[PDB]
């Protein structure tokens, strides 16, 4: 494929997973805890977690479509006694790196989106433990909420980079929202979830509105940090998808040129 | 460079070394030993060895020009925290393979042309040892000629392939006019020179024209085999030069596409 319309006709459209990820980000952003505004109790807003499922499905599907297109291009290329022109293997190697990057990013984005989803899930569930008390107070069963948060921390997704992955490069690329082991195991830094957990009072806590709002503001600060981490990684994923499109345009042009000069 | 005129404007013109090699082949082909035709002694024709020098110089110059153009293209290409697009290194790798092939072929063609030259030289020098005897006979100082031939065999050029060279591939590419060691040392098979050497009578040999012509025909058969070996390798070199031109056209197109999509 040489144009964007050509790419879509070959079954690849990066706008699909990128928009579904954007929708998931908007869903996360929309989540709100209960509050008391000028004295009236306002129910929170919980997350429709299926938006996150839709994003995970689209990211998986896009990676499959990308791999399929590379496989077709590779087949096009492959395609004393004069041996096969070395440029053909060279381009196959470039294709192989492309396949690795597709897979890596799909795995990383799947895992991070599952994490993002699980944070949305806990921030929805925990609202059952915040309620109106008296005419001007809030009750927060914070011990129950700590347990919910710890359940998330305990089950954070891990991801395995492709064999041969340049670990130093991936550490730079992903940043410190994750850790990567020397064997390519990517784990999610639990620091924001820990800060959220440690902010909570015990069960049965009764707070005046002002103290509740101070806590909610701190909690939201951590929530917004997690949203920023995911926004950042979705932007990097979008750059990868742009790189893929450019790779295909390069390979298609190469194949065209080699066909004319054949 | 995207067109052939563009390549020549970038300092690369494969026609130059290829034509100088063709001229050397024609010079070799033109060599003829003395003879007696319908009773009259006909001087042989010796080789202008400078034609071979011109070819060696042109092959060296072409390889330099090719490397220089690749170096310029590489510079054009080179050119959390989002890391450099992997396609750039991939194309650099392809360039690196290109540089290796240029060097390898230059070394092989230089050495084989030196060999070819040295055979032309001995086939010229040896004519001093063939002369008219009587009205109908030829005298051949064949021992002196054996010594000249052995001097060539003893000083055949050797060539070293680039480090990392795929030895099995190069053995297939070059064929059995050469041998290649597991360490990439290319040596020239002396079999035709040995057959030429072993065809010769001793010093002072006096032959009737018919016996001389039988010997000359056998000698020429070996000479023509050596010409065919070199013609074959020059054709393979021409294919390499075509591959280089295609490589540049591919890389230029890639750089163009990546510039538009940047």
UniProtKB/Swiss-Prot annotation, chains A, B:
InterPro entries: BipD-like_sf (IPR036708), IpaD/BipD/SipD (IPR009483). The keyword Coiled coil applies. It is found in: Secreted. Its main location: secreted. It holds the Pfam family T3SS_TC. Keywords: Coiled coil, Secreted, Virulence. GO terms for cellular component: extracellular region. NCBIfam families: SipD_IpaD_SspD. Belongs to the invasin protein D family. Human meliodoisis patients have detectable antibody response to BipD. However, BipD does not act as a protective antigen. The N-terminal domain is an intra-molecular chaperone that prevents premature oligomerization of the residues on the coiled-coil region that are involved in interactions with the needle and/or itself. The residues in the C-terminal domain probably form oligomeric structures at the tip of the needle that are responsible for the regulation of secretion of other effectors. Required for invasion of epithelial cells, as well as for survival within host cells, escape from endocytic vesicles and subsequent actin-tail formation. Probably regulates the secretion of effectors BipB and BipC and their final integration into the target cell membrane. This is Translocator protein BipD. The lineage of its organism: Bacteria, Pseudomonadati, Pseudomonadota, Betaproteobacteria, Burkholderiales.
């Amino acid at each position: 494929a040489m144009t964007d319309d050509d790419l879509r006709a070959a079954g690849v459209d990066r706008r699909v997973p990128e928009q579904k990820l954007g929708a998931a980000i908007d869903e996360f952003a929309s989540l709100r805890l209960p509050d008391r505004i000028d004295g009236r109790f306002v129910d929170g807003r919980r997350a429709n977690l299926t938006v996150f499922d839709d994003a995970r499905v689209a990211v998986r599907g896009h990676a499959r479509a990308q791999r399929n297109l590379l496989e077709r291009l590779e087949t096009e290329l492959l395609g004393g006694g004069i041996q096969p022109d070395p440029i053909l293997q060279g381009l196959v190697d470039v294709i192989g790196q492309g396949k690795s990057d597709i897979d890596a990013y799909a795995t990383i984005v799947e895992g991070l989106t599952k994490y993002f989803q699980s944070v949305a899930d806990v921030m929805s569930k925990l609202q059952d433990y915040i309620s109106a008390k008296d005419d001007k107070n809030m009750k927060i069963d914070g011990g129950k909420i700590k347990a919910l948060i710890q359940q998330v921390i305990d089950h954070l997704p891990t991801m395995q980079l492709p064999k041969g992955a340049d670990i130093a490069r991936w550490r730079k690329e992903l940043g410190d929202a994750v850790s990567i082991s020397d064997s390519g195991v990517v784990t999610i830094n639990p620091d924001k979830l820990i800060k959220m957990r440690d902010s909570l009072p015990p069960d049965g806590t009764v707070w005046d509105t002002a103290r509740y709002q101070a806590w909610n503001t701190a909690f939201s600060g951590q929530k917004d940090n997690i949203q920023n981490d995911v926004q950042t990684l979705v932007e990097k994923y979008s750059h990868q998808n742009s790189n893929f499109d450019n790779l295909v345009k390069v390979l298609s042009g190469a194949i065209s040129t080699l066909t004319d000069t054949a």
